[PDB]
Short mmCIF file of C-alpha atoms and ligand atoms in Angstrom, two decimals:
data_model
loop_
_atom_site.label_atom_id
_atom_site.label_comp_id
_atom_site.label_asym_id
_atom_site.label_seq_id
_atom_site.Cartn_x
_atom_site.Cartn_y
_atom_site.Cartn_z
CA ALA A 177 -91.50 28.19 -7.93
CA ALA A 178 -87.63 27.02 -7.25
CA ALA A 179 -85.90 24.99 -10.20
CA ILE A 180 -84.03 21.90 -8.58
CA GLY A 181 -80.51 20.39 -9.29
CA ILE A 182 -80.50 16.49 -10.21
CA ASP A 183 -77.32 14.23 -10.01
CA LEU A 184 -78.78 11.35 -12.08
CA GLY A 185 -75.88 9.12 -11.04
CA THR A 186 -75.14 5.68 -12.16
CA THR A 187 -76.00 3.61 -8.74
CA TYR A 188 -77.45 6.57 -6.63
CA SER A 189 -79.26 10.00 -7.70
CA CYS A 190 -79.44 13.33 -5.36
CA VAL A 191 -81.59 16.39 -5.46
CA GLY A 192 -81.04 19.97 -4.53
CA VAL A 193 -82.76 23.48 -4.49
CA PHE A 194 -80.98 26.58 -4.00
CA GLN A 195 -82.80 29.22 -2.07
CA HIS A 196 -81.69 32.25 0.12
CA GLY A 197 -78.27 32.18 -0.85
CA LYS A 198 -77.77 28.50 0.01
CA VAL A 199 -78.31 24.84 -1.23
CA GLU A 200 -80.71 22.43 0.64
CA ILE A 201 -79.94 18.93 -0.26
CA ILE A 202 -83.45 16.90 0.27
CA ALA A 203 -83.61 13.88 2.08
CA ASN A 204 -86.08 11.27 0.97
CA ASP A 205 -89.16 9.49 2.69
CA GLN A 206 -86.24 7.26 4.38
CA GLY A 207 -84.18 10.23 5.49
CA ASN A 208 -81.56 9.53 2.72
CA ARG A 209 -79.92 12.50 0.98
CA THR A 210 -79.28 9.96 -1.98
CA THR A 211 -81.52 7.63 -3.65
CA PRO A 212 -80.64 4.33 -5.59
CA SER A 213 -80.98 4.66 -9.27
CA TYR A 214 -82.95 1.60 -8.96
CA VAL A 215 -86.67 0.75 -10.30
CA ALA A 216 -88.39 -2.67 -9.65
CA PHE A 217 -91.22 -4.51 -11.23
CA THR A 218 -93.40 -6.80 -9.07
CA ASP A 219 -96.51 -8.98 -9.46
CA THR A 220 -98.50 -6.02 -7.96
CA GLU A 221 -96.20 -2.57 -7.58
CA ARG A 222 -93.47 -0.52 -9.60
CA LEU A 223 -90.78 0.62 -7.05
CA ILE A 224 -88.20 3.37 -7.06
CA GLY A 225 -85.06 4.13 -5.07
CA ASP A 226 -84.80 2.72 -1.52
CA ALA A 227 -87.83 0.40 -2.03
CA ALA A 228 -86.57 -1.06 -5.32
CA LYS A 229 -82.74 -1.47 -3.97
CA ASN A 230 -84.37 -3.36 -0.61
CA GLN A 231 -85.87 -6.20 -2.57
CA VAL A 232 -83.13 -6.52 -5.22
CA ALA A 233 -81.94 -10.02 -3.58
CA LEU A 234 -85.82 -11.17 -3.62
CA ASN A 235 -86.49 -10.00 -7.65
CA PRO A 236 -83.34 -9.60 -9.16
CA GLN A 237 -84.45 -10.50 -12.93
CA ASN A 238 -86.81 -7.55 -12.67
CA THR A 239 -84.94 -4.96 -10.55
CA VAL A 240 -83.49 -2.43 -13.20
CA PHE A 241 -80.22 -0.58 -12.35
CA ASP A 242 -77.23 1.02 -14.47
CA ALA A 243 -79.83 2.40 -17.24
CA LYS A 244 -77.07 5.07 -17.29
CA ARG A 245 -74.73 2.55 -19.33
CA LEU A 246 -77.62 2.43 -21.90
CA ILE A 247 -79.04 5.67 -22.13
CA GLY A 248 -78.53 7.33 -25.62
CA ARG A 249 -76.63 4.11 -27.11
CA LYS A 250 -77.75 1.85 -29.89
CA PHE A 251 -78.21 -1.78 -29.08
CA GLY A 252 -74.98 -2.78 -31.56
CA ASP A 253 -72.81 -0.40 -29.24
CA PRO A 254 -69.83 -2.75 -28.09
CA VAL A 255 -70.21 -1.29 -24.65
CA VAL A 256 -73.85 -2.29 -24.48
CA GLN A 257 -73.05 -5.82 -25.78
CA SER A 258 -70.07 -6.17 -23.11
CA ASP A 259 -72.06 -4.55 -20.44
CA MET A 260 -75.11 -6.75 -20.80
CA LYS A 261 -73.20 -9.79 -19.09
CA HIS A 262 -72.99 -7.84 -15.78
CA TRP A 263 -76.80 -7.79 -15.80
CA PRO A 264 -79.53 -10.07 -14.46
CA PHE A 265 -82.22 -8.47 -16.26
CA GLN A 266 -82.86 -9.07 -20.09
CA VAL A 267 -81.85 -6.39 -22.55
CA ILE A 268 -83.51 -6.75 -26.02
CA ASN A 269 -83.17 -4.88 -29.62
CA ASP A 270 -85.91 -2.75 -30.99
CA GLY A 271 -84.67 -0.98 -34.09
CA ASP A 272 -81.25 -0.76 -32.87
CA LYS A 273 -82.23 0.66 -29.48
CA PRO A 274 -81.69 -1.23 -26.22
CA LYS A 275 -85.11 -1.74 -24.10
CA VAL A 276 -84.88 -3.44 -20.63
CA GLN A 277 -87.30 -6.54 -20.60
CA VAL A 278 -89.17 -7.14 -17.27
CA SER A 279 -92.21 -8.90 -15.91
CA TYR A 280 -94.92 -6.38 -14.32
CA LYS A 281 -98.43 -7.26 -13.13
CA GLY A 282 -97.93 -10.95 -14.81
CA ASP A 283 -97.14 -9.28 -18.48
CA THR A 284 -93.94 -9.08 -20.20
CA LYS A 285 -93.12 -5.14 -20.77
CA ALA A 286 -89.97 -3.54 -22.28
CA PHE A 287 -88.64 0.07 -21.10
CA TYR A 288 -86.13 2.34 -23.13
CA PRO A 289 -83.21 3.71 -20.73
CA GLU A 290 -84.39 7.19 -20.54
CA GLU A 291 -87.97 5.63 -19.70
CA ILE A 292 -86.25 3.75 -16.57
CA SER A 293 -84.07 7.24 -15.74
CA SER A 294 -87.43 9.11 -16.03
CA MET A 295 -89.06 7.01 -13.52
CA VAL A 296 -85.86 7.66 -11.08
CA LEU A 297 -86.08 11.59 -12.01
CA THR A 298 -89.60 11.33 -11.16
CA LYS A 299 -89.00 9.76 -7.55
CA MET A 300 -86.20 12.86 -7.18
CA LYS A 301 -89.07 15.43 -8.53
CA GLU A 302 -91.55 13.95 -5.80
CA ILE A 303 -88.78 14.16 -3.04
CA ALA A 304 -88.14 18.11 -3.51
CA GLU A 305 -92.12 18.45 -3.93
CA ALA A 306 -92.51 16.84 -0.48
CA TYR A 307 -90.04 19.34 0.86
CA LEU A 308 -91.03 22.67 -1.12
CA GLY A 309 -95.10 21.80 -0.68
CA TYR A 310 -95.62 22.48 -4.41
CA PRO A 311 -95.15 21.03 -7.78
CA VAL A 312 -91.40 21.53 -9.39
CA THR A 313 -91.47 22.24 -13.14
CA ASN A 314 -87.83 23.47 -13.91
CA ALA A 315 -84.50 21.34 -13.62
CA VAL A 316 -80.76 21.29 -14.33
CA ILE A 317 -79.69 17.75 -14.64
CA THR A 318 -75.88 16.47 -14.90
CA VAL A 319 -74.24 14.11 -17.08
CA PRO A 320 -70.47 12.84 -17.42
CA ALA A 321 -68.33 15.38 -19.33
CA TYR A 322 -67.59 12.54 -22.23
CA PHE A 323 -71.23 11.97 -22.39
CA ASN A 324 -71.99 12.50 -26.64
CA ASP A 325 -75.16 14.38 -28.20
CA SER A 326 -76.91 11.17 -28.03
CA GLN A 327 -76.77 10.56 -24.25
CA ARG A 328 -77.09 14.22 -23.50
CA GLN A 329 -80.55 14.27 -25.19
CA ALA A 330 -81.83 10.92 -24.05
CA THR A 331 -80.72 12.18 -20.54
CA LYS A 332 -82.78 15.42 -21.34
CA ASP A 333 -85.79 13.13 -22.68
CA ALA A 334 -85.79 11.25 -19.39
CA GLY A 335 -86.27 14.92 -17.79
CA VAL A 336 -89.22 15.63 -20.03
CA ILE A 337 -90.85 12.18 -19.78
CA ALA A 338 -90.91 13.02 -15.85
CA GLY A 339 -92.62 16.18 -16.48
CA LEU A 340 -89.42 18.55 -15.93
CA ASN A 341 -88.27 21.40 -18.21
CA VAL A 342 -84.86 21.09 -18.58
CA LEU A 343 -83.17 24.14 -18.06
CA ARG A 344 -79.91 22.82 -18.97
CA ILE A 345 -77.66 19.61 -19.20
CA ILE A 346 -74.29 20.52 -17.71
CA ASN A 347 -71.31 18.45 -16.81
CA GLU A 348 -70.80 16.60 -13.76
CA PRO A 349 -67.26 17.90 -12.88
CA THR A 350 -68.69 21.68 -13.71
CA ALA A 351 -71.02 21.22 -11.35
CA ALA A 352 -68.76 19.92 -8.48
CA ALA A 353 -66.48 23.07 -9.20
CA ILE A 354 -69.69 25.42 -8.94
CA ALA A 355 -70.66 23.33 -5.71
CA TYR A 356 -67.09 25.05 -4.44
CA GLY A 357 -67.60 28.50 -6.15
CA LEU A 358 -64.58 27.96 -8.29
CA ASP A 359 -66.67 29.31 -11.51
CA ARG A 360 -66.20 32.87 -9.93
CA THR A 361 -62.29 33.05 -10.03
CA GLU A 362 -56.78 30.75 -15.77
CA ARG A 363 -57.36 28.27 -12.78
CA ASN A 364 -56.68 24.62 -13.01
CA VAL A 365 -59.09 22.36 -11.19
CA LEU A 366 -58.72 18.59 -11.07
CA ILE A 367 -62.14 16.70 -10.11
CA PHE A 368 -61.77 13.17 -8.41
CA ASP A 369 -64.80 11.54 -8.93
CA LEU A 370 -65.33 7.83 -7.26
CA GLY A 371 -68.85 6.42 -7.06
CA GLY A 372 -70.58 2.92 -7.10
CA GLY A 373 -69.71 1.70 -10.23
CA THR A 374 -67.54 4.54 -12.40
CA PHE A 375 -64.09 6.52 -11.54
CA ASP A 376 -64.08 9.93 -13.40
CA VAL A 377 -60.93 12.08 -13.31
CA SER A 378 -61.57 15.60 -15.21
CA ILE A 379 -59.12 18.45 -15.62
CA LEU A 380 -60.98 21.90 -16.02
CA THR A 381 -59.26 25.34 -16.91
CA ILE A 382 -61.88 28.21 -15.32
CA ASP A 383 -61.08 31.54 -16.88
CA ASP A 384 -63.32 34.43 -16.09
CA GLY A 385 -66.52 32.21 -15.49
CA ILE A 386 -65.77 29.92 -18.52
CA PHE A 387 -65.22 26.14 -18.29
CA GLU A 388 -62.80 24.15 -20.59
CA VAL A 389 -62.56 20.35 -20.20
CA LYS A 390 -58.46 19.91 -20.68
CA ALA A 391 -58.60 16.28 -20.11
CA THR A 392 -60.86 13.21 -18.90
CA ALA A 393 -59.79 9.88 -17.45
CA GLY A 394 -60.74 7.06 -15.38
CA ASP A 395 -62.21 3.42 -15.46
CA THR A 396 -66.17 3.35 -16.32
CA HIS A 397 -66.10 -0.06 -14.54
CA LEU A 398 -64.09 0.69 -11.39
CA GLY A 399 -66.29 1.84 -8.18
CA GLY A 400 -67.41 1.37 -4.48
CA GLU A 401 -69.19 -2.09 -5.65
CA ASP A 402 -65.74 -3.62 -6.93
CA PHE A 403 -64.30 -3.03 -3.14
CA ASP A 404 -67.68 -4.51 -1.87
CA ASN A 405 -66.97 -7.51 -3.93
CA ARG A 406 -63.75 -7.84 -2.40
CA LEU A 407 -65.03 -8.12 1.06
CA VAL A 408 -67.72 -10.56 -0.63
CA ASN A 409 -65.11 -13.09 -1.40
CA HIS A 410 -63.04 -12.60 1.75
CA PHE A 411 -66.33 -13.50 3.67
CA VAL A 412 -67.30 -16.25 1.30
CA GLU A 413 -63.83 -18.08 2.04
CA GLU A 414 -64.28 -17.05 6.20
CA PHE A 415 -67.76 -18.99 5.97
CA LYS A 416 -66.21 -22.13 4.12
CA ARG A 417 -63.21 -22.08 6.74
CA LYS A 418 -65.81 -22.02 9.51
CA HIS A 419 -68.58 -23.93 8.60
CA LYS A 420 -67.19 -26.17 5.68
CA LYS A 421 -70.09 -24.76 3.36
CA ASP A 422 -69.75 -22.86 -0.05
CA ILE A 423 -72.49 -20.10 -0.03
CA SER A 424 -71.19 -18.72 -3.67
CA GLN A 425 -73.97 -20.49 -5.96
CA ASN A 426 -76.64 -19.23 -3.57
CA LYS A 427 -77.67 -16.16 -5.35
CA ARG A 428 -79.64 -14.81 -2.42
CA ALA A 429 -77.00 -15.51 0.20
CA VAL A 430 -74.38 -13.80 -1.68
CA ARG A 431 -76.75 -10.73 -2.47
CA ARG A 432 -77.41 -10.65 1.04
CA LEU A 433 -73.56 -10.86 2.07
CA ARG A 434 -72.69 -7.84 -0.50
CA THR A 435 -75.21 -5.61 0.96
CA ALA A 436 -73.69 -6.19 4.82
CA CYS A 437 -70.41 -5.79 3.19
CA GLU A 438 -71.29 -2.26 1.60
CA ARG A 439 -72.77 -1.19 4.93
CA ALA A 440 -69.43 -2.85 6.82
CA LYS A 441 -67.16 -0.67 4.34
CA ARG A 442 -69.08 2.58 5.00
CA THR A 443 -68.24 2.26 8.78
CA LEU A 444 -64.84 1.62 8.17
CA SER A 445 -64.81 5.22 6.92
CA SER A 446 -65.08 6.55 10.29
CA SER A 447 -64.05 3.49 12.42
CA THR A 448 -61.07 1.14 12.36
CA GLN A 449 -63.46 -1.92 12.61
CA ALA A 450 -67.10 -2.89 11.67
CA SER A 451 -69.32 -5.88 12.85
CA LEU A 452 -70.81 -8.10 10.02
CA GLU A 453 -73.98 -9.97 11.73
CA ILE A 454 -76.35 -11.63 9.18
CA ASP A 455 -79.29 -13.98 10.45
CA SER A 456 -79.86 -17.19 8.32
CA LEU A 457 -77.24 -16.52 5.64
CA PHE A 458 -76.66 -19.73 4.50
CA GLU A 459 -78.89 -23.08 5.57
CA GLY A 460 -79.88 -21.38 8.83
CA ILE A 461 -76.26 -20.38 9.66
CA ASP A 462 -76.09 -17.01 11.15
CA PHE A 463 -73.06 -15.03 10.10
CA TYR A 464 -71.61 -13.04 13.16
CA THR A 465 -68.04 -11.67 12.36
CA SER A 466 -65.89 -8.42 11.88
CA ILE A 467 -63.53 -6.47 9.46
CA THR A 468 -60.75 -4.02 10.47
CA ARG A 469 -60.06 -0.91 8.28
CA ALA A 470 -56.71 -2.37 7.69
CA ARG A 471 -57.67 -5.82 6.48
CA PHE A 472 -60.16 -3.80 4.03
CA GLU A 473 -57.27 -1.78 2.90
CA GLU A 474 -55.07 -4.77 2.37
CA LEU A 475 -57.94 -6.55 0.31
CA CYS A 476 -58.53 -3.16 -1.73
CA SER A 477 -54.83 -2.12 -2.09
CA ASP A 478 -54.45 -2.73 -5.68
CA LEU A 479 -57.53 -1.16 -6.49
CA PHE A 480 -57.24 2.01 -4.52
CA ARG A 481 -53.82 2.52 -6.03
CA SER A 482 -55.08 2.02 -9.39
CA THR A 483 -56.90 5.52 -9.17
CA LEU A 484 -53.71 7.47 -9.37
CA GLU A 485 -53.21 5.99 -12.96
CA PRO A 486 -56.01 8.10 -14.49
CA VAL A 487 -54.83 11.07 -12.49
CA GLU A 488 -51.32 10.56 -13.88
CA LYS A 489 -53.19 10.21 -17.55
CA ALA A 490 -55.35 13.28 -17.13
CA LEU A 491 -52.18 15.75 -15.89
CA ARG A 492 -50.05 14.02 -19.00
CA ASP A 493 -53.16 14.89 -21.48
CA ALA A 494 -53.65 18.31 -20.21
CA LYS A 495 -49.88 18.91 -20.40
CA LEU A 496 -49.67 20.31 -16.62
CA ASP A 497 -47.38 19.31 -13.61
CA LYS A 498 -49.05 18.43 -10.29
CA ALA A 499 -47.87 21.96 -8.93
CA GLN A 500 -50.04 23.49 -11.91
CA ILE A 501 -53.44 22.20 -10.45
CA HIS A 502 -54.85 25.08 -8.01
CA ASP A 503 -57.63 22.87 -6.42
CA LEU A 504 -58.51 19.24 -6.01
CA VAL A 505 -62.25 18.47 -5.57
CA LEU A 506 -63.27 15.14 -3.86
CA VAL A 507 -66.81 13.81 -5.16
CA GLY A 508 -68.57 10.48 -5.40
CA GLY A 509 -69.53 8.53 -2.11
CA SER A 510 -66.32 6.17 -2.57
CA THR A 511 -63.65 9.20 -1.80
CA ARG A 512 -65.15 8.74 2.15
CA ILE A 513 -62.50 5.95 2.31
CA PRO A 514 -59.74 7.59 4.35
CA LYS A 515 -56.91 5.41 2.16
CA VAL A 516 -58.33 6.86 -0.95
CA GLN A 517 -58.03 10.45 0.36
CA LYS A 518 -54.34 9.63 1.68
CA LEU A 519 -53.26 8.32 -2.05
CA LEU A 520 -54.56 11.57 -3.71
CA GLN A 521 -53.13 13.88 -1.37
CA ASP A 522 -49.84 12.05 -0.94
CA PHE A 523 -49.85 11.97 -5.03
CA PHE A 524 -50.27 15.95 -4.50
CA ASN A 525 -47.52 15.98 -2.14
CA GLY A 526 -49.91 17.22 0.80
CA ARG A 527 -52.24 19.48 -0.79
CA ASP A 528 -55.85 20.25 0.71
CA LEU A 529 -58.63 18.35 -0.53
CA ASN A 530 -61.89 20.18 -1.23
CA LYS A 531 -64.29 17.82 0.87
CA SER A 532 -66.39 19.91 3.02
CA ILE A 533 -69.53 19.03 0.79
CA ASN A 534 -70.65 15.71 0.99
CA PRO A 535 -69.06 14.14 -2.13
CA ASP A 536 -72.19 12.18 -3.13
CA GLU A 537 -74.29 15.44 -3.05
CA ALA A 538 -71.31 18.00 -4.51
CA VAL A 539 -72.66 17.37 -8.18
CA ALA A 540 -76.36 17.81 -7.29
CA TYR A 541 -75.21 21.11 -5.03
CA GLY A 542 -73.65 22.77 -7.93
CA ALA A 543 -76.63 21.56 -10.33
CA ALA A 544 -79.01 23.34 -7.54
CA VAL A 545 -76.81 26.55 -7.78
CA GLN A 546 -76.77 26.59 -11.75
CA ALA A 547 -80.65 25.79 -11.66
CA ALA A 548 -81.31 28.81 -9.62
CA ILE A 549 -79.02 31.14 -11.93
CA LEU A 550 -80.58 30.17 -14.93
CA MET A 551 -84.11 31.13 -13.26
N1 ADP B 57 -68.87 6.30 4.07
C1 ADP B 57 -68.63 5.63 3.09
N2 ADP B 57 -67.30 4.67 3.07
C2 ADP B 57 -67.21 4.48 1.50
N3 ADP B 57 -67.93 4.27 0.69
C3 ADP B 57 -68.95 5.25 0.81
C4 ADP B 57 -69.46 5.73 1.92
N4 ADP B 57 -70.58 6.22 1.63
C5 ADP B 57 -70.95 6.02 0.42
N5 ADP B 57 -70.04 4.88 -0.19
C6 ADP B 57 -70.00 4.79 -1.55
O1 ADP B 57 -70.34 5.30 -2.51
C7 ADP B 57 -70.99 4.79 -3.51
C8 ADP B 57 -72.06 5.40 -4.31
O2 ADP B 57 -71.33 6.89 -4.78
P1 ADP B 57 -72.51 7.89 -5.12
O3 ADP B 57 -71.64 8.92 -6.06
O4 ADP B 57 -73.65 8.29 -4.28
O5 ADP B 57 -73.20 7.07 -6.54
P2 ADP B 57 -73.01 7.05 -8.07
O6 ADP B 57 -72.41 5.55 -8.25
O7 ADP B 57 -74.26 7.04 -8.89
O8 ADP B 57 -71.74 7.71 -8.63
C9 ADP B 57 -71.23 3.30 -3.20
O9 ADP B 57 -70.17 2.35 -3.56
C10 ADP B 57 -71.42 3.48 -1.64
O10 ADP B 57 -71.11 2.29 -0.98
CA1 CA B 58 -66.66 -2.83 -11.31
CA1 CA B 59 -72.13 10.03 -7.67
#
């Protein structure tokens, strides 16, 4: 029986299996090679992944996400108290431990972060089992390099609740390096990891297969969703101009526009323009418009440039110059943005980016390789 590698990401998760010298990144029931880190509770069902995220506009109070921001933290942790303002779902205190409180089948229920994450891991486990055709019992799960003992244990506990023997908890940047075979080489590797909600820069030194985390930098609240937000605000103003109506206080309309903006953003990574066509956005008014890559880049120019500041800090903390970095590794779904690739490459004076592996799959890819080694 094959062991699996799971990237348990802030906003998306990804599962891979290493068989016959190569990694299969496993598509879910909807054909998606990543799955939202989302759990929704309704009057009749518990939804996980695509089904959960797809009804977020309908059911905001009972659609749980960002469990990774809570996992292994105390309720009184300043990060928890600060983050609670970003969430439409209720977080309560159960003996200095945070629980997400929701309505499920007409009853008030509360879940520990590792319980929510266990449901995401169960989905990823089931996705792998559908592909392999037998039950999976062994997994490597990845965490950020800066995760403490509490956050690592809570992540492992999520795995155990999901019915997995957790072979090892390994660092996300290390998994990304393993995906590119950089573990087999001192080599200095910079991991540039821009996801949906978080930006992580890591400098690893690899010496005879041994990894040392020399520096970690970034922004725990900078991600692709910030770029979506810049598009949302742009189109809210456009709708005001054309229809003399403010949609900003209609939560459903804003969430539906946000979904359309995220889809348009993805198109702008491969095309120089994208069409944004929403039926009945507000008071039965259809919103059919477009966005150029250039305008998108203008709207996010400051946010894109800000990604180089943690790169500068990481190099300074690692006591390394640009030329002393041997390999640049692009990971996280947001690194598909051409302007982000340009900024990093230009900063490193034309150096190649390791980007041949789907950036939102590289961490799961490496986890799958390491899972097979440990088996
Ligand atoms: N082609 C693309 N162009 C731009 N952004 C993309 C593209 N594909 C995915 N993304 C973005 O990647 C982010 C998710 O990154 P991922 O690493 O999968 O998740 P996580 O947030 O869990 O780290 C989202 O903001 C999504 O919009
Ligand atoms: Ca943000
Ligand atoms: Ca990611």
